[PDB]
Design a protein around this ligand. Structure first.
Ligand SMILES: [Ca+2]
Ligand SMILES: [Ca+2]
Ligand code: NA
Length: 225
């Protein structure tokens, strides 16, 4: 039943409240997802002024229900199966030689809109590290989300690495651990091991003077032949 809600273009809303080393900020995002093509287009705005961390570090936090699951893998799509009641998505993101983000999000339909509502808490950051020092490039992010069933929670777990380019040519590693739990009581699809091949490009709206990020993202399930 969940999978039927994604056969067309779906409007997306993202709302994030954050506190990173006591820097409090909010982010509002809008756009649309077409799961048939694994395609997401979004624009995010910092509504509190200047974002106190680099946009790239927030990208993974700011809707894996928009993944293109190949037909032969459709029985492994936990994300859409939880809809419309939705799922809780939790992460710890460990920035190597720096702080961590912990995130708790509720992803669900509000009428015909897919909504991602997030709380983000960041601690242990260095004031002149790559995050609070704003030393990261703004360009593109890709990786493979490794998913396994979590039957004890009627949900999934995932892990993956992101390598953020630093302006010196080096990389800032962000190790991600993830847990998803259904909000509702409907049955969900507990998957075999597989991965999401995910890539996005970050850009700027030439007309936009607010602190913002434009994103074009493609997400495809794989790793079952
Ligand atoms: Ca940035
Ligand atoms: Ca380079
Ligand atoms: Na679609």
């Amino acid at each position: 039943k969940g999978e039927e809600l994604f056969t067309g273009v779906v409007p997306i809303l993202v709302e994030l409240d954050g506190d990173v080393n006591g820097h409090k900020f909010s982010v509002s995002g809008e756009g649309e997802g077409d799961a048939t093509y694994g395609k997401l287009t979004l624009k995010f705005i910092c509504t509190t002024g200047k974002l106190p961390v680099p946009w790239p570090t927030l990208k993974t936090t700011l809707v894996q229900c928009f993944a293109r699951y190949p037909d032969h893998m459709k029985q492994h799509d936990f994300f859409k199966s939880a809809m419309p009641e939705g799922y809780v998505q939790e992460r710890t993101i460990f920035f190597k030689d720096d702080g961590n983000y912990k995130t708790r999000a509720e992803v669900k339909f509000e009428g015909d809109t897919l909504v991602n509502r997030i709380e983000l808490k960041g601690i242990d950051f260095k004031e002149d590290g790559n995050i609070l020092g704003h030393k990261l490039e703004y360009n593109a992010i890709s990786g493979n989300v490794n998913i396994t069933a979590d039957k004890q929670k009627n949900g999934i777990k995932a892990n993956f690495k992101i390598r953020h380019n630093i302006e010196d040519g080096s990389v800032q590693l962000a190790d991600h651990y993830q847990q998803n739990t259904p909000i509702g009581d409907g049955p969900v699809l507990l998957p075999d091991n597989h991965y999401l091949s995910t890539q996005s490009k970050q850009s700027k709206d030439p007309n936009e003077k607010r602190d913002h990020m434009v994103l074009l993202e493609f997400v495809t399930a794989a790793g079952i032949t």
